[PDB]
Design a protein around this ligand. Structure first.
Ligand code: 7UE
Ligand code: K
Length: 536
């Protein structure tokens, strides 16, 4: 019995299976392909999914949602603290941990965000078990690419509590790229931008995919922007439209506002395929019927700042990834709000007409990729960057990873100390900033350098890779022609596919700490005489 991929989203969750060469997204008991991430508690029962979201108006103090916003955080976290000012349900400080507090069958009960989300995994489990007719245990579950090891572990804990064996935790932008098979496209490396706009969150992620390996170069977004905000703009417009045409403010009637919000979400769906949408609400306030219309143009005007604003996280991420928008090879639309025609055009205009990858249901694509990965775990170019130690144990790359073979690349270095007699050349493998966090391939001395002031001697290191993967590293003293070389054996299978992933992921986890370290040294390709990692 195969494994499942689950997208445990902030507001909605989704479950997929790869069975007999096809990925199927599994509907819930009420026929929905997506289930609200809501756990409602009452005097009698525990509600999960649609029935919990459906009773929110009756039991808002005991209905929990947005548990992804607490999961793996301190109670004192600024996001936690401010986020509470919008949640009808109670959050409390147990030993510096958030715990949502709720009344369940007369008694008061407290749950950790892992437990809340575990109940959502329990529902997705049962939904797949009803579809598949068999117990499901093995599952891949996705997380936002910006999640820290504490939030990934918390998510895994929710799955384990749920009775799930979590085969692996993968980033939502990577699953989305998997879904679209971007890792099976030939050619050099590829940069992918994932534009993910859900009901409540916005995430932009830039990835590079070469030889089936994914590195997340950058993440930007807005954790408090989503389709609900667009609905909110519609709601306020119509409330003022009612006040202007009926001299009545409906907002102090709670049921009246809800019915309006519900009308507005419907029309926003219509305005993705039509240029106009109707509002037909009987007896909305004080017996007045509200029958009116909103054009897509008026809808776009109400969300002009919000729609154009999404290009800023797009620009930040291209910046942080040190890429020009001309260097993106694929754009993936993810999230149901990416169906909004204006969102699509903005992004497409910003990318000079580039087509958008959007043929998979953007609500489903993350679970779909997560299902491709579950079945995989269930049943050329250089692998790593190559470089030498410069002053400070710093990694100075000469052959970037994913570079085609055979290649030859050369750089000129200099001495760090005055009258340096020699440089010790130390070849390294890896994507970390410091050589100590990388793999030492070989060492050799270049000696007999004519004494001079620091930065005057010229040392030309060349990296040469034939087509068998035989790396050859040589240094020439430019003032005399003296040279030395090392030949590095290409051991077949020395690194597994998963070995490369661990190195790439460590550079992803510490990219910031590595960033600052690269900045601190001013060597600019100076070479010392000793191994930096062996000095007292
Ligand atoms: O979630 C949204 O913002 C959204 C916007 N436009 C259209 C849809 N839509 C249409 C058919 C199924 C979903 C959803
Ligand atoms: K997820």
């Amino acid at each position: 019995g195969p494994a499942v991929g689950i997208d445990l989203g902030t507001t909605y969750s989704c479950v997929g299976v790869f069975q007999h060469g096809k990925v199927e997204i599994i509907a819930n008991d009420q026929g929905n392909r997506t289930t609200p991430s809501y756990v409602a508690f009452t005097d009698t029962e525990r509600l999960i999914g649609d029935a919990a979201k459906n009773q929110v108006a009756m039991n808002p103090t005991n209905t929990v949602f947005d548990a992804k916003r607490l999961i793996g955080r301190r109670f004192d976290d600024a996001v936690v603290q401010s986020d509470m000012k919008h949640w009808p349900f109670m959050v409390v400080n147990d030993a510096g941990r958030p715990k949502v507090q709720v009344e369940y069958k007369g008694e008061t009960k407290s749950f950790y965000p892992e437990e809340v989300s575990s109940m959502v995994l329990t529902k997705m489990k049962e939904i797949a078990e009803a579809y598949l007719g068999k117990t499901v245990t093995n599952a891949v579950v996705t997380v936002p690419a910006y999640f820290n090891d504490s939030q990934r572990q918390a998510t895994k804990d929710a799955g384990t509590i749920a009775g799930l064996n979590v085969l692996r935790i993968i980033n939502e932008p990577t699953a989305a790229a998997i879904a679209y098979g971007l890792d099976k496209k030939v050619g050099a490396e590829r940069n992918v931008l994932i534009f993910d706009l859900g009901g409540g969150t916005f995430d932009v992620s830039i990835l590079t995919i070469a030889a089936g390996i994914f590195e997340v170069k950058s993440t930007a977004g807005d954790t408090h922007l989503g389709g609900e905000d667009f609905d909110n703009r519609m709601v306020n417009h119509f409330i003022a439209e009612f006040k202007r045409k009926h001299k009545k403010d409906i907002s102090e009637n709670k049921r009246a506002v809800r019915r309006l919000r519900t009308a507005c979400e419907r029309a926003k769906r219509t305005l993705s395929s039509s240029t106009q949408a109707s509002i037909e609400i009987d007896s909305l306030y004080e017996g007045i019927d509200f029958y009116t219309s909103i054009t897509r143009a008026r809808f776009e005007e109400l969300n002009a700042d919000l729609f154009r604003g999404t290009l800023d996280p797009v620009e930040k991420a291209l910046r942080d990834a040190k890429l020009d928008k001309s260097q993106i090879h694929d754009i993936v639309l993810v999230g149901g709000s990416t169906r909004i025609p204006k969102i699509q055009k903005l992004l497409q205009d910003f990318f000079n007409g580039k087509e958008l990858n959007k043929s998979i249901n953007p609500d489903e694509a993350v679970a779909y990729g997560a299902a491709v990965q579950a079945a995989i775990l269930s049943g050329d170019v250089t692998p790593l960057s190559l470089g030498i130690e410069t002053a400070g144990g710093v990694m100075t790359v000469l052959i970037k990873r994913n570079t085609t073979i055979p290649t030859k690349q050369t750089q000129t270095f200099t001495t760090y100390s005055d009258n340096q007699p020699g440089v010790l050349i130390q070849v390294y493998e890896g994507e970390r900033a410091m050589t100590k966090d990388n793999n030492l391939l070989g060492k050799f001395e270049l000696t007999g350098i004519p004494p001079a002031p620091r930065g005057v001697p010229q040392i030309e290191v060349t990296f040469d890779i034939d087509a068998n993967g035989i790396l050859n590293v040589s240094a020439v003293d430019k003032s005399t022609g003296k040279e030395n070389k090392i030949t590095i054996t290409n051991d077949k299978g020395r690194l597994s596919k998963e070995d490369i992933e661990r190195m790439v992921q460590e550079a992803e986890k510490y990219k910031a700490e590595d960033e600052k370290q690269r900045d601190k040294v001013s060597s600019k390709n100076s070479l010392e005489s000793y191994a930096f990692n062996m000095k007292a």
